[PDB]
Amino acid sequence: DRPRFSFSIAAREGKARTGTIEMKRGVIRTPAFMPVGTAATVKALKPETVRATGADIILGNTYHLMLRPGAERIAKLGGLHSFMGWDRPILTDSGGYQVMSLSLTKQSEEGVTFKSHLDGSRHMLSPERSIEIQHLLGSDIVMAFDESTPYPATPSRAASSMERSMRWAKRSRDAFDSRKEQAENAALFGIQQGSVFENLRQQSADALAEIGFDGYAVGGLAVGEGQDEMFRVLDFSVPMLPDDKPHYLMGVGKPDDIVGAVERGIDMFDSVLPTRSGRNGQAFTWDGPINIRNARFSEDLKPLDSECHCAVCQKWSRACIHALIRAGEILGAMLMTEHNIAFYQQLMQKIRDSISEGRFSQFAQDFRARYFARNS
Amino acid sequence: DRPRFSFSIAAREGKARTGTIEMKRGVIRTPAFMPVGTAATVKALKPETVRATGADIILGNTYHLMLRPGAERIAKLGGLHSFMGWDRPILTDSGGYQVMSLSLTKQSEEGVTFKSHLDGSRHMLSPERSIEIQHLLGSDIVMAFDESTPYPATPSRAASSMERSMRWAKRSRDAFDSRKEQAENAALFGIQQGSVFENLRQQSADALAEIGFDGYAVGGLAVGEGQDEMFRVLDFSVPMLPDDKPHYLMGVGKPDDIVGAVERGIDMFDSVLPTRSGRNGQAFTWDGPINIRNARFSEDLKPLDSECHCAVCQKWSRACIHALIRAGEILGAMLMTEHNIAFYQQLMQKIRDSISEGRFSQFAQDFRARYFARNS
Ligand SMILES: [Zn+2]
Ligand SMILES: [Zn+2]
């Protein structure tokens, strides 16, 4: 029998860690990359294809799921795992970020009321409502509901949102604990806030550790600050969180962002980049991203990446993917997307192996030299 | 205003002719190749794609259409042109060949009763019933109903089927003439029979010319006799038919069959070969057919054929079509099929142009030397 949630660290190198999260629906290898999940339709990669890229867990966007088809409908269909055809762990976000970035009728300490950008209907989110919707979705890792502060934020607005987020973190904790079916079978992560300000980040860390969570996310980054500033904030923010629990950097990111974040102690990542790039004709490679529409690929018989061992690179040449993309054939975008997600998983595997072997610092330096030289 | 049916010969070279058939729905350039038509679904090439290969007319199989979805249903949907999304001329066969080769309850001078190889239901064909079904389909060129004699045939069975076919030809003529809507707007072809026997072929020709048709088909070939014997029979059979009317060789054939048949006076052809080959990974080229699954094409950046100007060859390499076919992707079979039909139309255009210029005899010799050398 596997446990509800058990994080184990197998090896360390400086701030970097590798290990596993054991949950009832499966084992997650860390550092982990979560692809953003979709309904199982003909428009998206099949779930068996996503699993075969190496993904151990996928992410569901609560905001989009509550607009279409709705959380009650997903519960009636058997839950998010049945809906997505994915029987391994699923992490759901709280919905709060998309409320700021996509939807907004009322805002107060109680919660938020907002209008669907689809059909204008009114919806409500709060710590209690978010946790309940994530219960209806049946997700394995639940994110606490917080308040996002746009970039850039004044020190006053950053302090105010961080303090509200910590009161909302306690409310998410109590809501999660109130449902025995959820509390016995899922896990709950809290989210550190405080923008670029060290004292606010420390205030937030202390409040979260006092409440107590299964994992801790670093929020408020990857919203336009640039990598240098993001790394500077990670430098002091990650050591503030409890060492024996997973650290999750939400919405990051490009491959070099991930490598540097793992160097700073992050264990978990999610990003739409591999899928967005795949649909726009961009492939990630060890030599940097390439635009497959470029004429120089029209006669290039090599795979997208010379070392990738994804199913696409064992079979398909740059020239043929170039031909499919230039013709507008959906197969072209599917192959690009599969390779990009698999490339991210291969990046995580090399990170994990190099930490295990105590050579991650060298891997990161070798990785950057080659990725930025762009000898593709 | 275009006429019901006007065949005009623009140029001759020996027995070969080139010209046009003008009909109400369009002009047919001769010698002509008719691809075998299908319902407009996602499984088959779109009708606009078939037209863009150069096809002026397509063939409908009466036997298959009367089994599914049935001729009355096709009439209710607006006729075969609406059903196939094809607004240019359509030739329909009589159904009689598929009765022998695919279905058979009763046979007599009256007609035939047979069982659907699909659902076992009973159907009836006769000169009168065939012409009526082809009227319900709304086709532009109607084939007379005859009796096929299997290969090889004894002289006695060949004489008996030929004589019945000529009595059935008269009955088809009278049935076609009995419907003003059909007789004013469509054309009727009779079919010469007589197997390999010169005296029976002459008997058949005389009977058909006495009845009088808009066009004359040479039946009973391409059923296993081999090309040498087929050419030998064409040598004496085609001159027996009226010179100022089109000559149609049913079910032929391979590119070299077509060239040699045009040398012997044939104006019209149909064959499932380009489509069957396309779905089985075989492409026709000026250097003979190629099997695109062969490993030697996996890195071959040239198009299927070096001189073909079809839409596929302007864009797609052998290597990429090889990759699609080996992966089982329907796009691969579609591209092969489009190229094969377009290659046949380009063969007909080169035949027409070379006859016009009085160099067809040399084209045929050059064609055979290169096609059979197979330097692909
Ligand atoms: Zn790959
Ligand atoms: Zn071609």
Q: Which residue has the tokens 């950053």?
A: A158
Catalytic residue at B93? yes
Method of determination?
A: X-ray
State whether A320 and B315 contact (CB < 8 Å): no
CA B291–ligand 1 middle distance (angstroms): 28
Catalytic residue at A206? no
Q: Say how many CB pairs under 8 Å bridge A and B.
A: 28
User: By the CB < 8 Å criterion, does B311 face chain A?
Assistant: no
Which residues on neighbouring strands pair with residue A60, listed in sequence order? A92
State whether B315 and A301 contact (CB < 8 Å): no
Q: Which ligand is nearest to the CA of B311?
A: 2
User: Which three-class secondary structure state does DSSP give residue A223?
Assistant: coil
Phi and psi (nearest 5°) for A306? -65, -20
Contacts of the segment B292-297: beta carbons below 8 A, 24+ positions apart: B292/B318, B292/B321, B292/B322, B292/B325, B292/B336, B293/B322, B293/B325, B293/B326, B294/B322, B297/B321, B297/B322
Nearest alpha carbon to residue B337 among B253, B272, B274, B255: B274
| Dist. CA A55–CA A81, nearest whole Å | 15
| Dist. CA B146–CA B210, nearest whole Å | 17
State whether A316 and B323 contact (CB < 8 Å): yes
Q: Could you tell me which chain B residue has the CA closest to the CA of A330?
A: B331
Which residues on neighbouring strands pair with residue B90, listed in sequence order? B58
| Dist. CA B367–CA B214, nearest whole Å | 32
Substitution target from B298, B301, B320, B322 for chain A, most A beta carbons within 10 A: B320
Cα A84 to Cα A72, A74, A78, A139, B103: the distances in Å are 15, 10, 10, 11, 47
CA A288–ligand 2 middle distance (angstroms): 36
| Dist. CA B205–CA B194, nearest whole Å | 9
Contact A146, A97 (CB under 8 A): no
| Dist. CA B165–CA B126, nearest whole Å | 11
Question: Which tokens belong to B23?
Answer: 């009909």
| Dist. CA B172–CA B34, nearest whole Å | 23
Does B246 sit behind a cis peptide bond, omega within 30 degrees of 0 on the bond before it? no
Contact A183, A177 (CB under 8 A): yes
Question: Which tokens belong to B213?
Answer: 């048709």
| Dist. CA A28–CA A34, nearest whole Å | 10
Q: Which helix (H) or strand (E) holds B197?
A: none
Phi and psi (nearest 5°) for B143? -95, 135
Cα B166 to Cα B205, B209, B210, B338, B346: the distances in Å are 9, 11, 10, 38, 36
Q: Is B63 annotated as a binding residue?
A: no
Number of CB atoms found within 10 A of residue B316's CB? 24
* Element counts in chain A: helices (H) and strands (E): 16, 16
With left for phi above 0 and alpha for psi between -120 and 50, is residue B44 left, alpha or beta? beta
Q: Could you tell me which chain A residue has the CA closest to the CA of B327?
A: A315
Q: Which helix (H) or strand (E) holds A88?
A: none
Nearest alpha carbon to residue B37 among B207, B216, B232, B271: B271
Q: Which domains does chain A have, with CATH numbers?
A: 5-277+340-373 (3.20.20.105)
Q: Which ligand is nearest to the CA of B346?
A: 2
User: By the CB < 8 Å criterion, does A317 face chain B?
Assistant: yes
**Active-site residue, from A56, A214, A270, A300:** A270
Half-sphere exposure of B253 (CA within 13 A, CB side): 22
Cα B352 to Cα B30, B32, B287, B346: the distances in Å are 7, 9, 20, 10
Contact A209, A236 (CB under 8 A): no
Alpha helices in A178-297 (DSSP H): 180-183, 198-211, 227-237, 255-262, 273-279
Nearest alpha carbon to residue B96 among B66, B73, B56, B70: B66
CA B278–ligand 1 middle distance (angstroms): 30
User: Residues B55-85, buried b or exposed e (16+ Cβ, 10 A)?
Assistant: bbbbbbbbbbbbbeeebeebbeeebbbebbb
Resolution in A: 1.9
Q: Which ligand is nearest to the CA of A338?
A: 1
State whether B319 and A319 contact (CB < 8 Å): yes
Question: Which tokens belong to A242?
Answer: 């409890």
Residues in chain B: 376
| Dist. CA B340–CA B330, nearest whole Å | 15
CA angle, A128 then A270 then A318, to 5°: 150
State whether A317 and B315 contact (CB < 8 Å): no
Nearest alpha carbon to residue B90 among B135, B130, B146, B30: B135
Helix axis angle, A330-356 relative to A318-326, nearest 10°?
140
Contact B112, B99 (CB under 8 A): yes
| Dist. CA A238–CA A240, nearest whole Å | 5
Please provide the DSSP assignment of B44-56 as one string: S--HHHHHHTT-S
